[PDB]
């Protein structure tokens, strides 16, 4: 479960970023020894689009900063209550 | 350098604990897929022995909490300026 451990670390890192209301979706895969991932975070519906984009960039930087093997990460957002 | 990445994570986790003045020494090895490690942290010479022991236990819990493959960790302390 070495991929499981990595996914846990991604979810835990994303959830510690201000404005994140859970990880709705995470798809991670290996390209060689590198991780490529795609994620959807929850955000307050009343945040602006610009705020949601900022939170997404913060998640990107936090997750990549903590998990060195990640070479591609996309983060999008969706309203979550 | 998959062991290097693990050692970096141990050092980074230990250094984020209050009262830690650097990791003086870290020896990590694999027993199967598990990590066993021994470390020496720096501490304020003016801390009590009891305080240094507390900081050591905090390092132990922080590091083990963040790095799941670790199954044995000993943390000792030495005065550092």
How far from A25 is each of A12, A21, A22, A40, CA to CA, in Å?
13, 12, 9, 5
* Distance to chain A for B66, nearest Cα, Å: 9
Q: Which two tokens stand for residue B55?
A: 């900081």
Of the candidates B39, B5, B38, the residue with the CA atom closest to the CA atom of residue A35: B5
Across the interface, of A5, A68, A69, the residue whose CB is closest to B68 is: A5
Give yes or no for A16 touching B (CB within 8 A).
no
Distance CA A34, CA A69 (A): 5
Experimental method: X-ray
Residues 38-77 of A with CB under 8 A from B: 68-69
Which sequence spans correspond to the domains of chain A?
1-81
Distance CA B36, CA A52 (A): 42
Buried b / exposed e along B24-37 (16+ C-beta atoms within 10 A): eebebeeeeeebeb
- Chain B interface disruption, residue of A16, A68, A69, most B CBs within 10 A: A68
Query: Strand pairing of A23-31 and A70-79?
Result: unpaired
* Distance to chain B for A66, nearest Cα, Å: 9
**Which alpha helices (DSSP H) does A1-81 contain, by range?**
2-15, 49-66
């Amino acid at each position: 479960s070495h991929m499981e451990a990595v996914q846990n670390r991604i979810v835990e890192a994303a959830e510690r970023v201000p404005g994140v209301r859970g990880v709705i979706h995470l798809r991670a895969r290996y390209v060689g020894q590198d991780i490529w991932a795609d994620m959807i975070i929850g955000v307050d519906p009343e945040n602006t689009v610009e705020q949601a984009a900022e939170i997404c960039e913060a998640v990107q930087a936090a997750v990549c900063g903590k998990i060195r093997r990640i070479e591609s990460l996309h983060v999008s957002a969706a309203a979550r209550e």
